[PDB]
Amino acid sequence: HSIRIEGDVTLGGLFPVHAKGPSGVPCGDIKRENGIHRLEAMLYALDQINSDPNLLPNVTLGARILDTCSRDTYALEQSLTFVQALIQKDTSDVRCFVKPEKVVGVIGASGSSVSIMVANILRLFQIPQISYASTAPELSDDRRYDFFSRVVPPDSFQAQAMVDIVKALGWNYVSTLASEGSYGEKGVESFTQISKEAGGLCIAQSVRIPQERKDRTIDFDRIIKQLLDTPNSRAVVIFANDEDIKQILAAAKRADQVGHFLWVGSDSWGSKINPLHQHEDIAEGAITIQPKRATVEGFDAYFTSRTLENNRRNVWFAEYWEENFNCKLDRKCTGQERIGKDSNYEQEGKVQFVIDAVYAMAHALHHMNKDLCADYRGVCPEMEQAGGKKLLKYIRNVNFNGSAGTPVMFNKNGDAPGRYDIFQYQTTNTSNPGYRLIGQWTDELQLNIEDMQWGKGVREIPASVCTLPCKPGQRKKTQKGTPCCWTCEPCDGYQYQFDEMTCQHCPYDQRPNENRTGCQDIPIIKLEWHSPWAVIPVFLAMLGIIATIFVMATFIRYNDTPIVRASGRELSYVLLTGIFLCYIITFLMIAKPDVAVCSFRRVFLGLGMCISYAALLTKTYRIYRIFEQSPTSQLAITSSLISVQLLGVFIWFIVDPPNIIIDYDEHKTMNPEQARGVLKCDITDLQIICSLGYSILLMVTCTVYAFKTRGVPENFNEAKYIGFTMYTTCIVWLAFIPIFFGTAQSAEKLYIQTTTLTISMNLSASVALGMLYMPKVYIIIF
Amino acid sequence: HSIRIEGDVTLGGLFPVHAKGPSGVPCGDIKRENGIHRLEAMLYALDQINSDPNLLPNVTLGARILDTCSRDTYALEQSLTFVQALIQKDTSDVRCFVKPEKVVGVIGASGSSVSIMVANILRLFQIPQISYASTAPELSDDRRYDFFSRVVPPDSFQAQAMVDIVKALGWNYVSTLASEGSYGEKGVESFTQISKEAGGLCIAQSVRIPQERKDRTIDFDRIIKQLLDTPNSRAVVIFANDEDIKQILAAAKRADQVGHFLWVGSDSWGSKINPLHQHEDIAEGAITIQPKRATVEGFDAYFTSRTLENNRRNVWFAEYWEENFNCKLDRKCTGQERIGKDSNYEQEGKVQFVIDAVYAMAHALHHMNKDLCADYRGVCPEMEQAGGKKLLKYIRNVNFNGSAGTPVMFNKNGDAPGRYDIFQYQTTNTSNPGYRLIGQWTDELQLNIEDMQWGKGVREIPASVCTLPCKPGQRKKTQKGTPCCWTCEPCDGYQYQFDEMTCQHCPYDQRPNENRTGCQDIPIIKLEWHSPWAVIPVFLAMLGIIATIFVMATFIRYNDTPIVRASGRELSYVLLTGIFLCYIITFLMIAKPDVAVCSFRRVFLGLGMCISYAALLTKTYRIYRIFEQSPTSQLAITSSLISVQLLGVFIWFIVDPPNIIIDYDEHKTMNPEQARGVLKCDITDLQIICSLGYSILLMVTCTVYAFKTRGVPENFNEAKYIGFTMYTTCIVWLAFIPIFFGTAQSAEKLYIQTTTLTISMNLSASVALGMLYMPKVYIIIF
């Protein structure tokens, strides 16, 4: 039924001695892997606790060992058997008693579901509980389960370790697999939650393995095909049992995989040679996490020394002896004493945990005893009355070294901290085909990257980033999809990227560079005489300089002879100065200064044109008045109209400021690499047209009076010469207006107007001086 | 200890017989108001259940009555006593037994905490529970408490009824008050949650009343001052006990309140005379919600007929007898038999609930027994093995009539539906000063609005809306603040409200209306001859029409006499037609047609103006050529230049399309109510200037020719007449430009330019008409 050990203070114990069988009977056959090994461990702990004078020197400690049969309902009935001893008041019945048996704590509930039940029924009666094999993450809410403590870390720490290895090694795609039950699902659920909470990682696959059958071998193909749908995902994490992973590896081998994606194992994978067989090539490179294992020396010596006639407190030892050696009292066994010789048994990894659990209880009880009373040699009555939340507080704040090297402690929640060591499988080049240690995880991940290569490869050989990092000079961040990985699209070539996250538009009037770092147009467009067509006008201007160097030559000496006296001296000075004025104007407009000095050039063509025609205007009137019927008088009237032209540009300056702007923008989207720039001063089509039209207005009033001049027998050569010039001048002016209309639609017209205007002035001036100088050469050759 | 009743099937019972006292002893004195009345009710129910052949005919029903002492820890020790009888297996001890007592259900846990605790310990063992006095809303989660049922509705239904009355009667501002414990806080929390879930209501105040002392009378002044801060909130809901509300009403009375805000009571307020004393004026109009009460006739007869020698099963009856009459075995009592005479006792309102609870349990067992086995007369063995979720399912699906008229049922959650009746206090017009019924609440609110009139006024007199309706013709919705109640602001005056929630800008070119419903401008601006200054030009045009009827009068007969022959005949016809053409132009431009007929008008001033000067042009040339040294030739040269004017409008037709637009926009923000509009065809400043400027060229040439013509000894009066007219027109043409520029900045110039143009055309013609008149009067006089 239950083992009873006498003592003034006792603690209970739940262990799965038997195993559940058919639906009818709660439990049938016995189990040796976890049934008797753990009981003997607890009994051994109590024996040496009572022997040790360091802990509880003057007070003894007892216990009540008991079994659960691995059933929730059976656990509840038994847990009530602890507490009824103190809760029952009395019984009004007689047959024709026993000590109260006050318990102080309970140690057990190895499973998960039985722990949840026992925690729920003992939370009400305020009795502390310490578990040793309950790894489910559900028993982690302090509010939900007040009185509960664990010496074994849950799966949440294991999931944290995996995501730390994935994060540190560098990966973005991970595929999760899980088996049936409450282990695989809770593992991946924690893994997903931590990844979402920490950020930077994502889940791309999530397949579930049912347990309706094991001899199908089709669902395995379904999942492996599902995992192969995206070749980029090369890392998978597994939470299944050993049989499942054995099947998956077999499927991968028979499928002749070409990607050979990496695995990440859980505690079920661990370090065991049984699962791997003929799959050593495909299982290579699998990172597995396993809890640290320690072997004690005291328990083994104790357990190997017990026999039937030595100890009788244990009620299930005889049945275990019968089942272990397979002999019943048709084979009989008497005094074999070969438990450690006939059977090659090895202690489990959880024996160290139950020994630590008993210790933590004994230490907290020991501190509570010392703090409550110190003036009493034995057991003070204050201890019996005090119990409940006080002992739980002492259990949380405990710190010591157990049977293993590592210490034991409890954090805020109440579970022991996680300590794992990472393993890896290497066979293609390693001296030993077995697993090799590569790192540990206690509080921060400590992993030797250079220690793992698994042959013919660097430690960072595999890549899984969901997108190749795009840095060819263009980048942009798109919100579409999961925030895990980013997609980059080529933005327009007319602007550069800002903060490596967006393509903002750069300020105008300048092209972007090639590497998309700055937006500036170094190249510019400038007018040149040699390269563009401006050479021909330049040659024409040079030719005009030669012409005026010959007209004015025969003027210095020929100033008093009675040959030039026929022409008026005052009129001769006007034409001499007018011819030189236009020669300087064409040279000025040809040149393109950057500074705002064109103001002195615009008057050369605006005001310099009037004085050229002024002498011709008064000359026509002078030769016509003598036909219809004071040289200083003709000088005055011409001087007056010069002032009109001079005042014309002055009032223009008062109308609007003479601001000079050299900046220009092409604003062409056809060729973003092209950058056309033009600089001009006071460039207005109306300004140049109206200023030039002033001469045309007075030329009309002069030509009309010249119709009657033709045929006068005064100077036949001179009269015929003037009439020839008039028709030529009207020709160039009549052709000038059509030019700018219907042609400014393009972008290269900024330099063509200047050239055509240049040759127009030279052509109009050459014809004027040609007829004027025609009679002058007669006195030279003749 | 506990009352035990024999039976093959039994159910347990928890009742608070005693009350907790000092810290040492768990419970001390007994309570009569809830201790013994409820037990005797349950015992009576069991007796008549066993007597009634309708339910469980061949099978009896027993029970185990037991007390809880109103302690959480004590309730646990008792619950274990129920469950141990069936869960315990055996006990290995001897002294030198009792019936198994299999329970099937439990009825009890009156309080709130003990119900939560008992529900927690029995949920694990899967034993159904029915409570009768647990009204807390926490016991309403089916997931948290599987095996739990209630015959008394929780407080959530009460909070729903209040918010339904506030919503139905129409209010928006409410203030919440609550007391200490787990009743007031949970009540208002539910009220707040339902208000937010249903919507349309808000909480403006939330004050909390501690319970550290009872003789301070200061905290009440603080809260009433807090509640008086906003005069708008005239409705408060209270969840406190009777002592608290008695103090608040006293505080309101001594504060001489002027707002007299309304109250809404809870179940604690109910319908009692204790809560009202000298405050009848200020408590008037308090809507209170109370559960329906019914009185049974069987229990009273049973309880009044029991005596010490009659019944012995009850173990606490003797102590109750001693405490009820206050006599101990220094006053002794023997055989009084005046329980119903010496004490004026009345049964509680919860007795009907325990009787319903016992019934629901009996019916569910009756159905389960009938459904499970029907071929056996007695108790079939299947019933003992069957238990757990099945009986719970049969308890949920039950429906019958209990001791009261109303039936009992359980909804999806497991708590009985709420059924209340609404009360109100009235003491001015009603003959009866007491409370009067005004409505009921079972599934939908049924309230008689016309039946309640508080404050000696109309029913719906008080309102609390946070704001007036604010519908003066325009409104805007503001998101600031709580969505419950809103603030309205006046938007700009130039647009109307859209969907009664926003002020969008209506299309321009018109004005909005006054009620903010439409955006259209009916009024328009049209030129009139009578009202504006256009009368004077109109009268001038009429004067010219009369004047021209005199020049042509002496022209038909005087065509062959040798007096008029001095003037050119062809010239006379030209000037005769020119005068009549201008007379028609001034009339056409005066009129403003809306139709597309202005094209025939513009030619009157475009082409009809040149023909007026055409005769004048050739007249001056004709008299000048004879001075420098063929009537048909003069006719041809004038006829040609008319064609140029005729072609002038032709090229204008092909240059731009004659699009006519009558719409106009003032775009003035100074007067939003003003709407100015002008309709004109082809309104361009340059068009009228250039068309009129063409005639200036020819007139200028005539002016210079006439100036040189002066002094010729050919005509005396005619030469003097033509000299003066050439000097008069230049003045008005020179002044036309100054008034044209720098004047159009306003908005009323659309019609002032026409008037001045009309007069200008008339006066420019009268000077010519007067010049022709002088020769006419001369020949008449001569």
JSON list of C-alpha atoms in Angstrom, two decimals, chain B residues 3-13 42 46 50 56 59-65 81-83 85-86 99-107 127-128 358 361-362 365 379 383-384 391:
[
{"chain": "B", "resi": 3, "resn": "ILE", "atom": "CA", "xyz": [-27.41, 15.36, 10.83]},
{"chain": "B", "resi": 4, "resn": "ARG", "atom": "CA", "xyz": [-27.47, 11.96, 9.12]},
{"chain": "B", "resi": 5, "resn": "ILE", "atom": "CA", "xyz": [-30.53, 10.60, 7.32]},
{"chain": "B", "resi": 6, "resn": "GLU", "atom": "CA", "xyz": [-30.62, 7.00, 6.12]},
{"chain": "B", "resi": 7, "resn": "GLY", "atom": "CA", "xyz": [-31.02, 6.35, 2.41]},
{"chain": "B", "resi": 8, "resn": "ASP", "atom": "CA", "xyz": [-29.66, 4.35, -0.50]},
{"chain": "B", "resi": 9, "resn": "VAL", "atom": "CA", "xyz": [-28.95, 7.63, -2.35]},
{"chain": "B", "resi": 10, "resn": "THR", "atom": "CA", "xyz": [-27.89, 10.71, -0.40]},
{"chain": "B", "resi": 11, "resn": "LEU", "atom": "CA", "xyz": [-26.86, 14.31, -1.08]},
{"chain": "B", "resi": 12, "resn": "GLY", "atom": "CA", "xyz": [-24.82, 16.64, 1.09]},
{"chain": "B", "resi": 13, "resn": "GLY", "atom": "CA", "xyz": [-25.64, 20.06, 2.48]},
{"chain": "B", "resi": 42, "resn": "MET", "atom": "CA", "xyz": [-34.39, 21.45, 3.51]},
{"chain": "B", "resi": 46, "resn": "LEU", "atom": "CA", "xyz": [-36.86, 15.94, 1.87]},
{"chain": "B", "resi": 50, "resn": "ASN", "atom": "CA", "xyz": [-40.24, 11.07, 0.26]},
{"chain": "B", "resi": 56, "resn": "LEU", "atom": "CA", "xyz": [-38.88, 8.80, -7.28]},
{"chain": "B", "resi": 59, "resn": "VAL", "atom": "CA", "xyz": [-36.67, 4.82, -4.41]},
{"chain": "B", "resi": 60, "resn": "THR", "atom": "CA", "xyz": [-36.07, 7.03, -1.38]},
{"chain": "B", "resi": 61, "resn": "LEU", "atom": "CA", "xyz": [-33.70, 9.98, -1.03]},
{"chain": "B", "resi": 62, "resn": "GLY", "atom": "CA", "xyz": [-31.51, 10.82, 1.96]},
{"chain": "B", "resi": 63, "resn": "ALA", "atom": "CA", "xyz": [-29.18, 13.64, 2.93]},
{"chain": "B", "resi": 64, "resn": "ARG", "atom": "CA", "xyz": [-26.36, 14.68, 5.28]},
{"chain": "B", "resi": 65, "resn": "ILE", "atom": "CA", "xyz": [-26.93, 18.17, 6.71]},
{"chain": "B", "resi": 81, "resn": "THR", "atom": "CA", "xyz": [-15.74, 14.89, 4.95]},
{"chain": "B", "resi": 82, "resn": "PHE", "atom": "CA", "xyz": [-18.27, 14.47, 2.14]},
{"chain": "B", "resi": 83, "resn": "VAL", "atom": "CA", "xyz": [-15.84, 13.02, -0.38]},
{"chain": "B", "resi": 85, "resn": "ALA", "atom": "CA", "xyz": [-16.55, 8.21, 2.36]},
{"chain": "B", "resi": 86, "resn": "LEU", "atom": "CA", "xyz": [-16.34, 7.15, -1.30]},
{"chain": "B", "resi": 99, "resn": "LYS", "atom": "CA", "xyz": [-22.06, 2.33, 5.78]},
{"chain": "B", "resi": 100, "resn": "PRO", "atom": "CA", "xyz": [-20.27, 3.49, 2.60]},
{"chain": "B", "resi": 101, "resn": "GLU", "atom": "CA", "xyz": [-22.54, 6.56, 2.32]},
{"chain": "B", "resi": 102, "resn": "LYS", "atom": "CA", "xyz": [-22.25, 7.31, -1.40]},
{"chain": "B", "resi": 103, "resn": "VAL", "atom": "CA", "xyz": [-23.24, 10.93, -2.04]},
{"chain": "B", "resi": 104, "resn": "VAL", "atom": "CA", "xyz": [-24.56, 11.99, -5.45]},
{"chain": "B", "resi": 105, "resn": "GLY", "atom": "CA", "xyz": [-24.61, 15.80, -5.15]},
{"chain": "B", "resi": 106, "resn": "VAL", "atom": "CA", "xyz": [-24.23, 18.74, -2.79]},
{"chain": "B", "resi": 107, "resn": "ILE", "atom": "CA", "xyz": [-26.59, 21.64, -2.03]},
{"chain": "B", "resi": 127, "resn": "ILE", "atom": "CA", "xyz": [-19.64, 16.15, -8.01]},
{"chain": "B", "resi": 128, "resn": "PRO", "atom": "CA", "xyz": [-22.47, 18.55, -9.02]},
{"chain": "B", "resi": 358, "resn": "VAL", "atom": "CA", "xyz": [-33.66, 20.48, -3.62]},
{"chain": "B", "resi": 361, "resn": "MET", "atom": "CA", "xyz": [-31.74, 17.85, -7.79]},
{"chain": "B", "resi": 362, "resn": "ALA", "atom": "CA", "xyz": [-34.63, 15.43, -7.28]},
{"chain": "B", "resi": 365, "resn": "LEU", "atom": "CA", "xyz": [-32.05, 12.20, -10.55]},
{"chain": "B", "resi": 379, "resn": "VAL", "atom": "CA", "xyz": [-32.94, 0.64, -8.04]},
{"chain": "B", "resi": 383, "resn": "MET", "atom": "CA", "xyz": [-27.25, 3.99, -11.56]},
{"chain": "B", "resi": 384, "resn": "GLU", "atom": "CA", "xyz": [-24.54, 3.49, -8.93]},
{"chain": "B", "resi": 391, "resn": "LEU", "atom": "CA", "xyz": [-25.95, 14.12, -13.98]}
]
